[PDB]
Design an enzyme around this catalytic site. Structure first.
Site, PDB file in Angstrom:
ATOM      1  N   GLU A   1     -16.643   0.439  84.961  1.00  0.00           N
ATOM      2  CA  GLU A   1     -16.132   0.243  83.608  1.00  0.00           C
ATOM      3  C   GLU A   1     -17.188   0.503  82.539  1.00  0.00           C
ATOM      4  O   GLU A   1     -16.880   1.083  81.492  1.00  0.00           O
ATOM      5  CB  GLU A   1     -15.591  -1.183  83.448  1.00  0.00           C
ATOM      6  CG  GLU A   1     -14.522  -1.565  84.459  1.00  0.00           C
ATOM      7  CD  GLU A   1     -13.162  -0.989  84.126  1.00  0.00           C
ATOM      8  OE1 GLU A   1     -12.707  -1.167  82.978  1.00  0.00           O
ATOM      9  OE2 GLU A   1     -12.556  -0.349  85.012  1.00  0.00           O
TER      10      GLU A   1
ATOM     11  N   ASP B   1      -6.418   6.374  75.273  1.00  0.00           N
ATOM     12  CA  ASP B   1      -5.633   6.427  76.495  1.00  0.00           C
ATOM     13  C   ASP B   1      -4.264   5.801  76.299  1.00  0.00           C
ATOM     14  O   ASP B   1      -3.610   5.426  77.281  1.00  0.00           O
ATOM     15  CB  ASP B   1      -6.381   5.733  77.633  1.00  0.00           C
ATOM     16  CG  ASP B   1      -6.630   4.257  77.357  1.00  0.00           C
ATOM     17  OD1 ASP B   1      -6.454   3.810  76.200  1.00  0.00           O
ATOM     18  OD2 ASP B   1      -6.996   3.553  78.317  1.00  0.00           O
TER      19      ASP B   1
ATOM     20  N   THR C   1      -9.620  -1.337  74.437  1.00  0.00           N
ATOM     21  CA  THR C   1      -9.968  -1.819  75.769  1.00  0.00           C
ATOM     22  C   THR C   1     -11.140  -2.785  75.630  1.00  0.00           C
ATOM     23  O   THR C   1     -12.152  -2.437  75.014  1.00  0.00           O
ATOM     24  CB  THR C   1     -10.343  -0.615  76.640  1.00  0.00           C
ATOM     25  OG1 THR C   1      -9.210   0.252  76.731  1.00  0.00           O
ATOM     26  CG2 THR C   1     -10.737  -1.024  78.035  1.00  0.00           C
TER      27      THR C   1
END
Length: 241
Positions: free
Chosen positions: A18, A34, A39
């Site tokens: 990540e 995305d 995120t």
């Protein structure tokens, strides 16, 4: 599930995948384009899915009237709409990052991660008859990236596609090492050509995690003993104790 050491190792692998570090990044926030909005944090909780909302709900129950409370109405609408919009979250990324080392905020992330990702990964592992720590660690990483939804890119969709290709799960008698190699193949294929077009660019750039995990299998380290050395052209070189 995973014992204390195995679970830590699994999480440090995910942390490399990540964020490029074995240190879990609770303060991370980034728009990845995305389709998922922002995120965030240790699991890449996103604003389009509702899981970042859950972190803020849990944190707000524990710490009323905190700096993130005012974002709840927008986070709720983004979850309802499955929306990539971040234009009504001014200050959110900085506020989240400012809590990177806050005990209560980290605890809220740990609780949501446990409920949404770790426990479902261990439950589906049990349902598939997985016995090895490495296979369980692969399941844990998979649910964090793919989610536990009903869509064709989801954790359980990958399990079912693997079961069909392998002729069953390890619970049915299929060799677990062979099954896991097929699972890694299925996951690679999904990352390269996901049903969700929004996530193509990001997921194609993430396929190296499949090879890192396969390299552990190829060392025959199915108990996830340490130290583990990761050597990846994409991520770099790491040691995990």
């Amino acid at each position: 599930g995973l014992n204390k050491d195995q679970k830590r190792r699994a999480e440090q692998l995910t942390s490399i995948f990540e964020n490029g570090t074995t240190e879990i990044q609770y303060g991370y926030v980034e728009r990845l384009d995305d389709g998922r909005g922002y995120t965030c944090g240790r699991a890449g909780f996103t604003t389009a899915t509702g899981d970042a909302l859950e972190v803020v709900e849990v944190y707000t129950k524990a710490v009323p009237n905190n700096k993130l409370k005012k974002y709840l109405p927008e986070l709720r609408r983004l979850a309802k709409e499955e929306s990539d919009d971040t234009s009504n979250l001014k200050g959110f990324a900085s506020a989240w990052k400012s809590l990177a080392n806050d005990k209560e905020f980290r605890a809220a992330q740990d609780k949501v991660n446990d409920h949404l990702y770790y426990q479902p990964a261990m439950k589906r592992s049990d349902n598939a008859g997985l016995k090895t720590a490495l296979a369980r660690a692969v399941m844990y990483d998979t649910v964090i990236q793919h989610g536990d939804g009903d869509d064709p890119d989801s954790f359980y969709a990958l399990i079912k596609r693997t079961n069909k290709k392998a002729g069953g799960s390890p619970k049915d008698g299929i060799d677990e090492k062979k099954w896991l190699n097929k699972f890694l193949d299925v996951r690679y294929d999904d990352l390269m050509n996901p049903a969700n077009h929004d996530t193509r660019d990001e997921w194609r750039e993430s396929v190296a995690r499949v090879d890192v995990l396969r390299s552990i299998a190829k060392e025959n380290n199915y108990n996830l003993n340490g130290p583990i050395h990761v050597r990846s052209n994409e991520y770099g070189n790491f040691v995990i104790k």
